[PDB]
């Protein structure tokens, strides 16, 4: 016979191993493949679709009220409207999104993100906003004069209902990490803030309070590494009927 010797690791069961194994049903003929719409081959395809950010995650906002940011006709100038924590690891407006949910099944990420805001006020409503992305380093800016110094886009409400703010991949390291420490230099992405560029102006018969819906997605330069179990799902007891499966 062939002389052999067993190596460490012999007999172990690694959940991520990759080997062939005995076919339970020999000569089994699987059902012929048929074409089905929507085949996905790489999870990156899925995270490239924009989904809604729960920007209004505040007490008093229930259900879908949390998905829209309401802005109203201001009395003062250069007003700050809202900011968005860019925490994907720590619970935040970006966590329950396609890109957020899937990324949380990994530990490392790299690539540009994109935020798209759709103005849902009346047609007679006008305004200009400024969306700013601030690379990490300091405190989140609270004035337009400061925010304006980062990556930004000035948005003019009009026929095209939506604007896009690219959050370009600006990092020292090839990848960032989903650290449980939000202030870590390998995790913090910076901030996104939104100010009135001018103001929201509407006529008497239009609602003087309008909503914005923010979406986010990954671009095709995105990459995810080191798979892990998502912190978004857990179990304390048996699910109903789980035990009755043995009866």
């Amino acid at each position: 016979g062939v002389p052999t010797y067993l190596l460490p690791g012999s007999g172990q069961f690694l959940t991520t191993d990759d080997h062939s194994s005995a076919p339970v049903l020999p000569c089994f003929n699987p059902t012929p493949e048929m074409h089905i719409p929507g085949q996905i081959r790489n999870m990156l395809e899925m995270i490239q679709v924009e989904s809604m950010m729960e920007i209004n995650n505040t007490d008093g906002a229930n259900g879908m009220e949390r998905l829209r940011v309401d802005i109203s006709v201001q009395a003062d100038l250069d007003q700050l409207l809202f900011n968005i924590p860019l925490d994907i690891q720590l619970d935040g407006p970006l966590r329950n999104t396609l890109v957020g949910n899937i990324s949380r099944y990994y530990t490392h990420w790299s690539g540009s993100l994109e935020m798209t805001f759709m103005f849902c006020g009346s047609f007679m409503a006008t305004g200009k906003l400024i969306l700013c992305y601030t690379p990490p380093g300091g405190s989140c800016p609270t004035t337009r004069e400061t925010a304006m110094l980062g990556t930004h886009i000035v948005w003019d409400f009009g026929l095209q209902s939506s604007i896009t703010l690219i959050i370009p991949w600006i990092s020292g390291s090839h990848y960032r990490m989903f650290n449980s420490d939000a202030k870590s230099t390998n995790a913090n992405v910076g901030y996104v803030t939104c100010f009135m560029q001018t103001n929201l102006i509407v006529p008497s018969e239009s609602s003087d309070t309008c909503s914005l819906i923010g979406f986010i997605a990954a671009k095709d330069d995105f990459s995810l590494r080191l798979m892990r179990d998502s912190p978004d799902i857990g179990q304390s007891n048996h699910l109903h009927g789980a035990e009755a499966a043995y009866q």
Binding site: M34, H35, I36, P37, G38, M46, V49, E50, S51, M52, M53, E54, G63, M64, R66, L67, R68, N96, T97, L98, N101, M118, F119, C120, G121, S122, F123, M124, A125, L159, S161, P203, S204, E205, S206, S207, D208, C210, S211, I213, F215, H240, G241
Partner: protein, 238 residues
């Protein structure tokens, strides 16, 4: 020029002067079942124009506190016109769908509806271990409404519903949404009375609002089956 659109099927046609282009679910387009994918061996009936046409369901009223509406296909049409007849007389059916949701208001109105076609939308019941019943699921032409649109009544989330074929009706922008759905199933055909391939959901993410004269703002759904095929002819299960 992508804000204007006319759809014509059989003896029916629809135009819109405020469209937002239109969606082809998963980039596909309806087609008849090819021989190399077929299973049922009996020669099928392809009614064409008598079934592949627009059927308009009863409208719903968009109210300030509305949670959203849904219609399951083919259930919503299983009792309408010749489509319904074929469905009742045949064990197996197959078809795509051309969906056109319409809603107009005023340039002083605001509101945004997410119009999404959800494949295999299996509903869940709220705060109970008992699975939804037949009447909770089969609403027919009337359709149903969402109890907790926030989680699409299935424990997930409307926030990520955009992963499904969809469009929006944002009052300041457009007044209609159009989605072309191809056959979506793991089988080339199916029994129309006990399984729904698609679920049309229209949810007001941004509530209807205005300060002008108040008036009833309806939402209307028109659906046109496409490339209908029927097999397994027998008596009608009325």
């Amino acid at each position: 020029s992508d804000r204007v659109l006319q759809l014509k099927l059989g003896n029916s046609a629809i135009v819109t002067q405020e469209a937002a282009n239109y969606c082809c679910a998963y980039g596909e387009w309806p087609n008849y079942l090819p021989d190399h994918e077929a299973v049922a061996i009996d020669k099928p009936t392809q009614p064409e124009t008598s079934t592949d046409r627009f059927y308009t369901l009863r409208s719903v009223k968009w109210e300030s506190n509305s949670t959203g509406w849904w219609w399951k296909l083919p259930d919503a049409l299983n009792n309408i016109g010749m489509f319904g007849q074929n469905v009742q007389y045949h064990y197996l059916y197959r078809s795509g769908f051309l969906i056109h949701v319409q809603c107009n208001a005023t340039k002083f109105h605001q509101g945004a509806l997410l119009v999404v076609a959800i494949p295999e939308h299996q509903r869940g019941a709220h705060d109970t271990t008992t699975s939804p019943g037949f009447n909770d699921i089969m609403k027919g032409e009337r359709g149903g409404t969402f109890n907790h649109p926030y989680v699409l009544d299935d424990g997930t989330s409307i926030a990520c519903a955009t992963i499904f074929p969809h469009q929006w009706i944002n009052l300041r922008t457009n007044n209609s949404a159009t989605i072309v759905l191809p056959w979506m199933n793991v089988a080339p055909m199916d029994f129309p009375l006990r399984h729904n391939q698609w679920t049309l959901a229209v949810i007001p993410v941004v509530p209807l609002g205005t300060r002008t004269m108040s008036s009833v703002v309806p939402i209307t759904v028109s659906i046109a089956p496409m490339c209908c095929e029927f097999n397994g002819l027998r008596h009608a299960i009325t």
